[PDB]
Design a protein around this ligand. Structure first.
Ligand SMILES: [Zn+2]
Lengths: 101, 183, 96, 110, 90
RNA sequence: CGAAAGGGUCCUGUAAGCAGUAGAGUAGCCUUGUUGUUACGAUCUGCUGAGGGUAAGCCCUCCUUCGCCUAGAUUUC
């Protein structure tokens, strides 16, 4: 279940987007910027156990290995395999392009 | 001013329409309406929602490979203003719109080619299994046509076809129930 | 409803008409902002009683675009031709 | 020019007449609007509804009235002695494939 | 101008060109059959209330002679040749 | 004028049904596997921005239909 599903769509309850997840997977600098926007001592497991695919911190290595068997992690894997939706795909959907000369 | 496109659904985003989401990585997302905005906030994939240009382009129901789509682009190198260039550009836009519409109609017909064969085969199957539901004349009508043919010395089958044509022209529906006569 | 920079030949009436009014087929006055009445209501326009003291009264207005999309919903199209060009060919088009 | 005894089939758009109506009252209000529609159509204050028409209105419970309905209204003579009105209308439900797309029609006498 | 050359090339090649009574007949017959099926389903919907009550068995209700006459007559049976009047009870 | 209908404009999100060398696997019949085959099987794809709704306080329609009409009653320097 979802904790406090009534206010799930509030901006203060927002979660990291899938295109950001792909960019974190592709380049470690973008992931490092996202991690520098956080505080290490206030994270589960002091930030040592992180799932990039779910964009989620975990209290222990066995907890990370545990959620990997779950279906939300597999949903994130299949969504990343399909590919997230970007502005390039948005322009290709309407047949629009960029002319740089 | 200019016309944007919705990030989620691709519809023309005119001024003062929709809302823009400013993400902290440097991304601005323009939505034409609160429908697209709320679907984005629910993290629904536009490629899976069948009412979007993203789904239609992924499914191949939009004409994407054509020469008429190479004329509109985001021009990042500006051109010095020229009155004749703008006028011939306007004429080009009109003619390109006409050609794009005609080729799009052709594309849609090649999408919908095999329909007529499918309904013909289904119609033949349905009639073959339901020969008994085809329109027919009443028994009293057959008796009266037989006696009229015997009286007039005419073709009974011809009278049958004419009477079938008359009931084919005259369509009547039936009503449920009926009034109960008071005492 | 056409301007010097928008070359679409269009009238002031939105697509589907004005909601609960109909179509404007006569001369019309476009006024900035809101006015005390509602739709269908008779309005009296009067000359200003005094000479104006603001620069806004002496400004010259230059329009670039007038919205003519539907106000019966989230209308994204200014003309029926624009809507048909965006949508494409429908099932009823080949049915007709 | 129109005779007293005459039957026509109509399509009644009950959706716009039941818009916003309380759920426990939608189907009786539908019956009353059918009676008012028949009175306005035929000029008769005496309207009698078929029990099959009542069943058709009540098919999906008290708040599941169909948006459209095809009916036949028959203005007939009231032959009973001491009748307040000389004419009355009888409303029946009509078996059709689809109540949409149909115009008002006059039922042939035969 | 290249687009115009392409347009006239496909017009010469036949890209914009546009194209049976028995097929129309069989489609009309299928549509008539579908309408009859819809009417039968509507009759079933009218007669059935199995959510609340059971249908009275047909053997417990005496069928009217006029209704049997009408139904067989539309089905195409000359009822005068078989004499349902003698078969009907009173 | 009214009731339908048609067109538009909006809302939702791709109907029922049929088909498919799509479908994880399972079980039979035989060519005992060579989409072997047939059967079932969440779902997927196509017909299908389709189906459904649309004034109830949306718009248009002498030129898409059917009806209605110069009343009745009461009062008045
Ligand atoms: Zn949008």
């Amino acid at each position: 279940g979802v904790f406090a599903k009534r206010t799930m769509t509030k901006t203060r309850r927002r979660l990291r987007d899938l295109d950001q997840i792909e960019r974190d997977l592709r380049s470690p600098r973008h992931l490092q910027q996202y991690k520098e926007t956080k505080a290490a001592e206030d994270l589960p497991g002091l930030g040592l156990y992180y799932c990039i695919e779910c964009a989620k911190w975990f209290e222990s290595e066995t907890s990370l290995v545990g959620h990997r068997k779950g279906k939300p992690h597999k949903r994130r894997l299949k969504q990343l395999k399909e590919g997230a939706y970007t502005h390039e795909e948005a322009m290709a959907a309407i047949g629009y392009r960029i002319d740089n000369g | 001013m200019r016309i944007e496109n919705c990030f989620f659904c691709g519809r023309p985003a005119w001024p003062s329409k929709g809302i823009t989401f400013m993400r902290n990585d440097g991304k601005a997302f323009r939505f034409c309406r609160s429908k697209c905005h709320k679907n984005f906030k629910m993290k629904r994939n536009p490629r899976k929602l069948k009412w979007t240009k993203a789904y239609r382009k992924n499914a191949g129901k939009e004409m994407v490979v054509d020469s008429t789509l190479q004329f509109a682009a985001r021009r990042n190198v500006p051109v010095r203003y020229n009155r004749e260039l703008w006028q011939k550009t306007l004429k080009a836009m009109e003619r390109i719109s006409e050609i794009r519409a005609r080729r799009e109609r052709v594309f849609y017909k090649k999408r919908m080619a095999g329909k007529r064969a499918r309904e013909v085969a289904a119609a033949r199957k349905l009639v073959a299994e339901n020969e008994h539901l085809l329109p027919r004349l009443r028994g009293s009508e057959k008796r009266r046509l037989a006696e009229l043919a015997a009286e007039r010395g005419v073709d009974v089958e011809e009278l049958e076809r004419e009477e079938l044509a008359k009931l084919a022209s005259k369509k009547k529906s039936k009503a449920f129930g009926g009034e109960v006569r008071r005492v | 409803a056409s301007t010097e920079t928008d070359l679409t030949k269009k009238k002031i009436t939105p697509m589907g008409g004005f909601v609960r009014y109909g179509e404007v087929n006569n001369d019309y006055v476009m006024i900035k902002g809101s006015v005390p009445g509602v739709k269908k209501r008779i309005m009296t326009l009067r000359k200003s009683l005094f000479t104006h003291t603001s620069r806004k009264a002496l400004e010259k207005v230059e329009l670039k675009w007038i919205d003519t999309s539907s106000e019966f919903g989230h209308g994204a199209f200014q003309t029926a031709a624009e809507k048909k060009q965006f949508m494409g060919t429908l099932k009823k088009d080949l049915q007709t | 020019a129109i005779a007293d005894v005459v039957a026509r089939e109509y399509t009644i758009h009950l959706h716009k007449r039941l818009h916003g109506v309380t759920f426990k009252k939608r189907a009786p209000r539908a019956i009353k609007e059918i009676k008012k529609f028949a009175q306005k159509a035929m000029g008769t204050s005496d309207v009698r509804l078929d029990p099959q028409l009542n069943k058709k209105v009540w098919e999906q419970g008290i708040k599941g009235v169909p948006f459209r309905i095809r009916v036949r209204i028959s203005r007939r003579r009231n032959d009973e002695e001491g009748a307040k009105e000389k004419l009355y209308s009888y409303v029946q439900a009509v078996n059709v494939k689809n109540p949409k797309g149909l115009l008002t029609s006059v039922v042939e006498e035969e | 101008q290249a687009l115009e050359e392409e347009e006239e090339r496909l017009e010469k090649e036949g890209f914009y060109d546009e194209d049976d009574e028995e097929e129309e007949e069989i489609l009309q017959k299928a549509e008539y059959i579908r309408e009859q099926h819809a009417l039968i389903r509507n009759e079933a919907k009218m007669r059935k209330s199995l959510k609340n009550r059971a249908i009275i068995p047909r053997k417990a209700v005496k069928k009217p002679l006029s209704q049997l006459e009408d139904h067989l007559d539309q089905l195409g049976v000359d009822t005068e040749a078989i004499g349902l009047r003698a078969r009907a009870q009173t």
